[PDB]
Design a protein around this ligand. Structure first.
Ligand SMILES: [Zn+2]
Length: 213
């Protein structure tokens, strides 16, 4: 209840964990495995507020110099019950965010999804447009939408910064004096839940938004 970790922090923890199951496959040096293991141990607990009771039990599982593929799915599954999910709003106070769009509606969203999501984005292919909602540095509904091209292509996403299936996302800004508005944007993961899954640091995303305004 007060050991509350964030979705982006969870993905970080996942990414460093899956890094360790790879040093049991790629790296030969005995001395390197030592510091790597130690390096990630300090990271995990530092991300928490305080290390609880079932945090000892959990860090234990990783100790072994050889982990397994069924070993990771909890730890990880066990880790998931520590995350604050994304706060999905009601269409009324969502209509206030996109005050101009005609009573727009939200899609699926399993629990697992809101547990990994720093922002939430869905595509409205009818109007070739990606809607994005997020909270910002003081828990509040901030929302945008832009023109998402209908081309998908391999390439790095300028939000999660990982090679993905990207489509150019273009928001309509405003230039010098009124009535003059040029389009700004870049390539981002077409599917935003995937983007989120690999969104390791929430600022990456903030930086992208501050690129658009
Ligand atoms: Zn991405």
């Amino acid at each position: 209840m007060k050991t509350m970790i964030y979705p982006h922090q969870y993905n970080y923890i996942r990414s460093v964990i899956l890094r360790l199951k790879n040093v049991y496959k790629t790296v030969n040096d005995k001395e390197t495995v030592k510091v790597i293991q130690s390096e990630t141990y300090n990271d995990i607990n530092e991300i928490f507020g305080h290390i609880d009771d079932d945090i000892e039990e959990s860090l234990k599982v990783l100790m072994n110099i050889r982990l397994s593929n069924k070993e990771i799915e909890a730890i990880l599954n066990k880790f998931l019950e520590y995350v604050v999910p994304f706060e999905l709003p009601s269409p009324q106070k969502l209509q206030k965010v996109f005050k101009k769009v005609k009573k727009i509606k939200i899609p699926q969203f399993e629990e697992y999804d809101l547990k990994v999501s720093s922002f939430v984005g869905w595509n409205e292919l009818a109007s070739n447009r990606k809607y994005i909602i997020y909270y910002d540095e003081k828990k509040q509904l901030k929302g945008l939408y832009g023109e998402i091209s209908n081309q998908v292509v391999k390439g790095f996403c300028t939000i999660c910064n990982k090679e993905s299936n990207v489509s150019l996302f273009m928001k309509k800004s405003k230039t010098n004096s009124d009535g003059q508005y040029v389009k700004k944007g870049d390539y981002i993961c077409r599917d935003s839940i995937h983007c989120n899954k690999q969104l390791t640091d929430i600022n990456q995303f903030y930086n992208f938004i501050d690129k658009l305004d």
